[model samples]
Target chain A: KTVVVTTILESPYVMMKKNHEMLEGNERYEGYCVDLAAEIAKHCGFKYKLTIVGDGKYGARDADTKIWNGMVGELVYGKADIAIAPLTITLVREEVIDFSKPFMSLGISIMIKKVSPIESAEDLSKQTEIAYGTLDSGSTKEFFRRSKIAVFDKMWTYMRSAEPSVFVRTTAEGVARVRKSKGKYAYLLESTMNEYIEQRKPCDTMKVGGNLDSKGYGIATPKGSSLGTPVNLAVLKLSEQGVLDKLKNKWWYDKGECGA
Target chain B: KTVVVTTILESPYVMMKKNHEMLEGNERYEGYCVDLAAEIAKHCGFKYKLTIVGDGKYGARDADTKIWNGMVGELVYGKADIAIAPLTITLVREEVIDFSKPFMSLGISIMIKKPQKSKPLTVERMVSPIESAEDLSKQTEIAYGTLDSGSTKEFFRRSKIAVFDKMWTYMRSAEPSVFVRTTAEGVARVRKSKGKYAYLLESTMNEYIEQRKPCDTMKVGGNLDSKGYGIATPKGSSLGTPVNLAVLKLSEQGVLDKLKNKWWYDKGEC
Candidate 1:
């Protein structure tokens, strides 16, 4: 039986081929996760199909109704056999689903224009000259939203009440805003995407300060899925063989549009 | 009014104080877990007692007996309230006990006697017999194995990778019992075997061993698999979420990383 895979359209992870109009089936897409999916399946010796999450979300639970949304919803509902994306491994997510040992390590990062004077989060939180925000309805936002630390609590207060909404709908919008805001905006995102963009053309952006927290991204499955064991082992083996690093360079830098 | 904690007596993670016999209660213990227990208790606002796991195991399920042993059993049978130790989190353990997000990252690694330059002059080369797990799998001169229990042993027994799988085959059936009952035994065999034995252990322990007195052992090869050590509790225990959150808080505050340096590096003999 063919396995059904769920993922999202994050840059350098899953992207439409330049001439997608001529491509079909799995070949229609090409990126890091795309390559990873093929590798994972090949090693596990399973035929599979790739499908994007219908809700275009990484997955979050609704506060009032407790309904899950995004790729997580797809797995929890059995719409897919596995999720291979830039999905984070968080405590809340692990409560409902199982995650393999992390395939990649990352932490929250600050993305800013090259000349911005804001050196760190502390600087941003103390000033109104440069407004800062995170991806709307995402883990970065949730981290700030749920944080009880004094400095992070201060950041959430400003973002929550900031006029015109500091939150952006997607990472691209956040990156674009950081690119064009003339030093008026800063975007907080995961380091994986942040460093990838820093190497791309129009290289006027860079990640600043230290990572605010540490975590990893893991391949996921519905709790107790028989597929979980083999998939987890495959990831670990791939990691040991340096396949994960090879894939990262292939997508993030090898084919990078910008130079060193 | 004090919480009970069960942990293993692994070096750096937990150890007896030199003056232990003169002390009483929690004061009798010192090391990484003892320090961590204090920090966690202070953050969550509670008092605690540190007790060594009676079985000296890291916790594993007996297939036929269906009994959980060591720190895991302590939590499962309500013998302890929490385990603040270098307990590696695995999927099987997660089913019976809850884990906090990893406080320290590690992997299974090969601990070998420091390479002696005694080699045939084919290239007058480094004669460290094994360079990778694949190398270890194909060779028989250098025997290798992990602790008889814990995640390290299970990683190989449960792995599907052909190389590691083959290595486990030789280990489980090796003559004279290749597996050790403790990390100390594993290290002792490595040093005493005169380059004839290699011990498989977690990176945390290997790294710790690399720095101690008589630094004759060193870690070789890429880490076998990535995983982490975390605080563990009985499934659905009320303390699970709070301790988990507290771990995250301390991690961000650099307490966990700091503790590693203090316990591992600050006390290093090398």
Candidate 2:
């Protein structure tokens, strides 16, 4: 009856109170991802407990050196019943885990300072002077390295070169690098996250170009988890009711005006 | 080894051309459906013979009259090895006959006149236009009904109505006015005879009918049923593969156009 939900503290999705005084996983202690998880649990006739991923990194297995962390690791290690974070589903992940129908849809995008020369992911592919990398173990890096599409395939060729260390340790590190490196470096991340960050106050970063390719963030669970069917049904109901769209917009757009 | 293949001359599918007066059932004598049939036979490594249906209609059973016709009856009667026509698969037909994975897709649509005032008539309009079915039950001149078949039985049962039991009871009375079509011919009677009768048929046949000269009929209703045509096997036959392959080949070759033109160009008025 009580589903243990796992999530992350990404701003807007899940932000600390700047003072770190609020208790973890309370009704008032909510974010976009937390709100979605709670609503889905309510619709599915279940109660839940929430916890953040022990390691802050998004789940990815390093191709050169295999390391697993984040919501994906939580599920694999039986620490959580479901991952309610914006976890993108990928073929590599699918081999070890199962994902419900997407809770949110997004595309991989490039974030650069407003004055940066990069206009799009395509510009990155076309021999740009600026360097770009993805969150160390997130879906974006895997997508670029594993993608069979034309532009990303070319981008992958550059990222694979041992020089330039085309992998960022965290989303913050990548964003900070973009801001400080003065258009010399860019961050590759989910279009949803990029758009959210672009609209914040004193925003100097702009997401350029159409998305490289579209994908979806899903509620992930261990393979053959019995919760798959009920969670899938709950997601479908939420989608039909427009709750999913409202949550995404409330977190990504009409923030501060609406409380989750 | 030679395989026995049964087919029908239902325009755009099979026809006796003046040029093919001498050829019979071979690949060269083949039209679109026949050519696909021939190729399927080749893939399955079986030689085949193509023959027309014993009765001209697609397939039907007159429940009240206890009569049956077409390749459907042939398969039921154990006369054919396989059928490779544009036969619409329905649920009732599936009870007595076995079918393979659907090789072609189709739906149910109504064909009306080109200049006809009504374009797409809803279920409410077709069954009862001016008033609800309960109110219309008292009137006489305006009558609406579905074809008498398995699909019709399921269609009616699935429809949510206030007087479902009453409608079912009325249809079971066997009055000609209650309207149960025993065959495609009966459906055609309503379609081509004009104003008094509206036919219910598969979209493939409906489109094929629309392309004929004078082009008197046009589809006027949304698909009542969405399903595909399967390569029907006679319960225990091994010929399903060849038949399935034949249909797939025909679909891939844009043969629907040729079949449409073949039926439309024919001189048959009805």
Candidate 3:
């Protein structure tokens, strides 16, 4: 039986290879997640098919109906066997899915186009002229809603109650908002994605200041899946052998969007 | 029955109170681990008796005998139900025992006694006397090593990277025996060696000792690698899931950072 894998379409992690329309099978996509999944399957010995999430969401629960959505729902409902993407290893996510140790580590930080005065969370909290928001229905959004730190608490207050709802459905949307807002907006996102965009063509985006907090990204499987052990062990195997480092540089640097 | 917790006697993580001779139960011990264990038991709803590891080792296996030792042994042999100390979350350990998400984060680093006048070669722009493992490896006057039989020593022993392997070979081949029996012994050697000895250990201990009285030791150079100390249980124990959750809960609530600040800074002597 072929295992089904779910991922999201975000730049650098998973994007078209320019000749994608001509390609077939797994060759249709090429990015960090695709490459990462290949290595994991190589070590894990699982033949799987990859599909993008249907609703174009990172998985969140609707408060009223209480139904989960996105790749997370795909796992919960047996629509997919695993999720191989930049899914963060957060507390809430851990409850519903078993995670291997982080294959990649990062922290939440700001993305602004080579800023004048704004630098970090504190800088964002004390200003109004430049608006800021996070990707909707993901770890970044959940982080602020639950944050206890003073600066983050204040920033979240403004984002949640801001006019026209500052949250975006996708990271791509947030990046576009920052780029088009012309110094009028900033996006709070994972430092890994922030740096990737910083190195891309046009090269105006910059990740500013130390991360507001720290954590990592992990591959996910349905809770207590028998596949957890081999996958977990393989991640450790890959990590100790330095394959993760090699893959990161390969996708994010060697064959990236533009000049590093 | 009270669950048994096995830990070590390392300072700050676990240490004796001044009046320990008269105290009883878990109260007889005080320090970061003791306080942390209390919080875990409170959250998880279990009564536990804290006991020091009898063999005074952090857990390693003998190649020939194939026997586990120290707190790891205590758990393996059914002597303890959990180990709540600064036990590192290593891949090797995960085979026999499970670990929670790291409650505290650190990396390997250099700890040197406050230095004296010296004609230095290639420093980090006057940031410190000797900086980075590269500088340490390139220099000859100062000697460096790690606590014997621990992760720091094991790190150097197993590393394939050029600099770390170089340091490991030197440590293995050093005249007069560079590796010390314990962290306390290593720090003691550093204090006594003046500018001649640099002890490499986790930054958590390095930062803690930097704030202790006599205050002669300091951490220099960026951390060499990243890891964390986690609460541990035998594999498949029901406690594993919740203990992991509690660690994340404390981390998200900022209690972990606050506890670190309290132990390392607020109660600091120097």
What lDDT would each prediction earn against the true structure? 0.84, 0.64, 0.82
> Judged by lDDT against the true structure, how good is candidate 3?
0.82
**lDDT, candidate 3, B114-158, per-residue tens:** 864444665533245688999899888999998865778766777
lDDT of 2 by residue, B187-264 (tens): 456555654445445676677667665666566645544455555578767675445444434433335334534544
Arranged by DockQ with the best first, the candidates are 3, 1, 2
DockQ winner among the candidates?
Answer: 3
Residue-by-residue lDDT tens digits, candidate 3, A102-125: 777788888897525876567668
In candidate 3, stretches whose alpha carbon ends up further than 4 angstroms from where it belongs are A115-123, A126-129, A148-154, A199-203, A249-260, B18-22, B114-130, B134-141, B211-215, B265-270
**Candidate 2 lDDT by residue in tens digits, A1-260:** 67788788786677665545655445645688778777777777778887777778768785576656788888887877888888886656766676665666667787888754566667677865777888877877676665555666788888877375868777877888888887777788888888777877558788887665546677888877988767766775565344666677677777533222
Pick by TM-score: 1 or 2, better one: 1
Candidate 1: residue B75 Cα off by (Å): 2.9
Every model: iRMSD: 5.4, 12.8, 2.1
Q: Which 10 successive residues of model 3 chain A have the least lDDT summed?
A: A114-123
Tell me, per candidate, how large a share of the native contacts it keeps.
0.00, 0.00, 0.23
Which regions in candidate 1 have their CA more than 4 angstroms from the true location?
A1-8, A22-84, A89-103, A108-213, A218-260, B117-127
Which DockQ-derived CAPRI band holds candidate 1? incorrect
